[PDB]
Amino acid sequence: TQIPILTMPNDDITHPTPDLTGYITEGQIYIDRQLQNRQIYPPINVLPSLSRLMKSAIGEGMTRRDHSDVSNQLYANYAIGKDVQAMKAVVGEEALSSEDLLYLEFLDKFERKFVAQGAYDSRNIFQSLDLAWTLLRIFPRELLHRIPGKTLDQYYSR
Amino acid sequence: GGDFSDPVTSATLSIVQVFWGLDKKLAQRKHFPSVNWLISYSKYSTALESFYEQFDPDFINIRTKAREVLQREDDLNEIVQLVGKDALAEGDKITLETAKLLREDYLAQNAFTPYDKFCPFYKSVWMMRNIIHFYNLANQAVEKGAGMDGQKITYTLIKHRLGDLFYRLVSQKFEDPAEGEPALVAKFKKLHEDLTAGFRALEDETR
Amino acid sequence: VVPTVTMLGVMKSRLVGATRGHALLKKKSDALTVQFRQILKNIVTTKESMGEVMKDSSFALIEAKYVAGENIKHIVLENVQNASIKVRSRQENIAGVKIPKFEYFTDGETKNDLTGLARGGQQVQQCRAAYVKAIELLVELASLQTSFLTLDEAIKTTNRRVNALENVVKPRLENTITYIKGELDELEREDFFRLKKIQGYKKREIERQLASS
């Protein structure tokens, strides 16, 4: 397995080397400058982050079955949370409904717990899935649209 | 003024661990230190952990809070430029107040005056602690928001009712370091105690 | 506009910020339009109540004429058992825009009543109800006017952004890229090739001289 740490000049991928290595390789995990500025030790940019072969890695025998489902659900919910943060900025946060506040607090808890990890703290992938699930319990069962049926009740019960 | 992608600049930032990137806009703004607090960075932070702990354990968290406040101000500056300050909430209001307080009192050092010529670490840490403490107290006050009042009303109240503390936070810069460290520490401790008294009586009055 | 990469980066950042701001303004405009539509529905309901309100009110006057005949007239003027003219209105910020909550008589503070006349009850049931309707009518009218003005301003800003800001910045970025590449890279490569040719034929001349000697 090859994991090059390629510095992107001028803080962009438009530079010849980042573009070339992106063309050659099959993934792109990102380090967001804002997260480091906001002082989150893992500055991983989850929204720009992507792996082409994510489906192959996740399975029943290796990893848990709900792994891909919670991955997609967290990604979509984080995008929604960013959108709702923008909405709260523009409207004054009074016009927001209950679900908007749910997405806001979900984003806040995500950045507080999941994104930030101890430099020496180690989490097994099972533990990481448990943490993501604990983040997920705050949403209602119906709200997790991306999560397949009979898998939501499998874990959302807690 | 030139692009920071210049080959000399790119080569330097590859090996150098601390970049004190000055800002042309700050220089035109006559902000004498002119150090940009966004592009600049010091990779040596992890090493100085023991030093900061032995000096003042609380300094790390207050520094992180100040960085977060600055980042939030810089982020929402675009929003307020576009949308306008009307939608700004009480938390946004206190955030902007603290950001302006930093930009004026803290990051600005004239250095042409005896009080600003040299700033010892003990005075710098106390000023940052005072600013962060005021920010925390304002956050708690606007968060309480009870008794048919509070939140933005509490923010305006503490702006007017507690205006003296806010004004003398700026004068805390003018405190002369030459007077001696024990005296300055005592004065700053008294200011911190008064700030704690603030937002506590304001807590007692319940707006 | 210097074709230097600094200007290219500045223009790219400006375009990205413009796109984000356009998205935010579109969301805000949509929310304001939804609120304005709700206010318009409420105002339509109040207008439907209007006219029938006056039809009900005329019955109070007929009852007064039947029972007490001519009114007191002059300062007294009779015909009133309730709904003293005292109100309480306040501007409230909704969706980032202050909206005056114009609560008029029969729904405003300090309203007073003085027993009932011969048709004072009919007046209260007819004229005072009209005041209650008019309170909501005024509040809804003010809110709708403010919301319409704000939505028009926001829609104009968003349309102006989409039609001018991006539509001018994108050509600026394209021109900067075209100039930078097709001038700097092309001419630098040509200079390097010319220098290489110079060295090559210098070596050729050296070889020719060596062969001669």
Swiss-Prot record, chain B:
It comes from the Eukaryota. Coiled coil: none annotated. One of its GO terms (cellular component) is plant-type vacuole. The keyword Repressor does not apply. Keywords: ATP-binding, Hydrogen ion transport, Ion transport, Nucleotide-binding, Translocase, Transport. GO terms for biological process: ATP metabolic process. The keyword Amino-acid biosynthesis does not apply. GO terms for molecular function: ATP binding; ATP hydrolysis activity; proton-transporting ATPase activity, rotational mechanism. Catalytic subunit of the peripheral V1 complex of vacuolar ATPase. V-ATPase vacuolar ATPase is responsible for acidifying a variety of intracellular compartments in eukaryotic cells. Belongs to the ATPase alpha/beta chains family. V-ATPase is a heteromultimeric enzyme composed of a peripheral catalytic V1 complex (main components: subunits A, B, C, D, E, and F) attached to an integral membrane V0 proton pore complex (main component: the proteolipid protein). This is V-type proton ATPase catalytic subunit A. The lineage of its organism: Eukaryota, Viridiplantae, Streptophyta, Embryophyta, Tracheophyta.
